[PDB]
Amino acid sequence: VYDAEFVGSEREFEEERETFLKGVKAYDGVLATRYLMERSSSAKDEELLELHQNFILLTGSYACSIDPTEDRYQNVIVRGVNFDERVQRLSTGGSPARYAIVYRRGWRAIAKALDIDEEDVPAIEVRAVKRNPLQPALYRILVRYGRVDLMPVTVDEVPPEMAGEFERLIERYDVPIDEKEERILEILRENPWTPHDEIARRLGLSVSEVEGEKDPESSGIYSLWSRVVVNIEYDERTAKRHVKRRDRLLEELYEHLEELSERYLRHPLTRRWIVEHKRDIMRRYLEQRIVECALKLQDRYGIREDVALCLARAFDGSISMIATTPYRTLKDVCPDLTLEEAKSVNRTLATLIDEHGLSPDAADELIEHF
Prior knowledge:
By secondary structure, the chain is mainly alpha-helical. It has three domains: 1-264, no CATH class; 265-301, Helix non-globular (Single alpha-helices involved in coiled-coils or other helix-helix interfaces), CATH 6.10.250; 302-370, DNA polymerase, domain 1. It has helices at residues 10-37, 46-64, 83-88, 96-101, 107-113, 136-144, 167-172, 179-190, 196-203, 207-211, 221-229, 236-261, 271-276, 278-301, 305-314, 319-323, 327-333, 339-345, 347-355, 360-369, and strands spanning 2-6, 73-78, 81-82. The protein has a three-stranded antiparallel beta sheet. β2 (73-78) and β3 form a beta hairpin. The chain is globular and about 60 Å long. It is classed as isomerase. Keywords: helix-hairpin-helix, topoisomerase, conformational change in protein, isomerase, guanidium hydrochloride.
């Protein structure tokens, strides 16, 4: 289930909606730009890319403004888990709403708390990896801690130490780093935009072990960045300049899109055209996401072709969702899955059975109920 009720006031309600709607508009810009990029290699053009990344920045910016008093929502569930209690028992607390939205399809709970009915499938996602102008993990953490100040609004504003030189920021604050984090940092030094599953696979870890809790007291890359960000004192002044700047940026970015679109496709890409082909566009990305995932499962995890496509389909092309799923669920939706296959893609499963001697069932509910 996906759910959340609005407990804020009426003034706060129409602020949220207004923040959400602008975010939805920003993320549509990400979808539209990606559609263009994948229509020639000559397109995959730095102007386009930069326009794409400015959209990622604005989506991220609005996303940071959600629940600014950190008390406007309650009972926030994303795929069953209750993010309220979770966020309560974390040293640094925070907004369960913003916490949610960093998860894939987490926006649905906030979608139901407000009554977003303007365009269908009103997604806001803040999970871009390979084209994100920021160090991806940091980008997500900024959203979690609602750092409107720190989140850049244009690509040219993006400081090196928040992208390819991310380590400078970590080191510029006097933050401790455990052994597991050092190993993770070593991979991001080669390529800061390495996906987390790929980092996991290489280090012999699970995605959760790589990520850690989005709190300084945990261990992992989310944890490390949480540790950094809470020692960066807030700059209410820059938050103001950002918040006041962006609505106009957003509009020129769309105008940029229409103009620049003509260089590739004969039917110009308008704001209206994006709203009216919302479904088909995402269906397009879901297809790619499924093909890639099947390809990855077969080649990188050694999974037979039929089963790969089966899992790829059941979990809408998200390997991290496959990896963190219980064997029982995995096997229900893909009858022919073998245990070795499941262990090959679920490190937690593998670590519980192999190193700890548990049965499938016992690992399965450790996996569910952490």
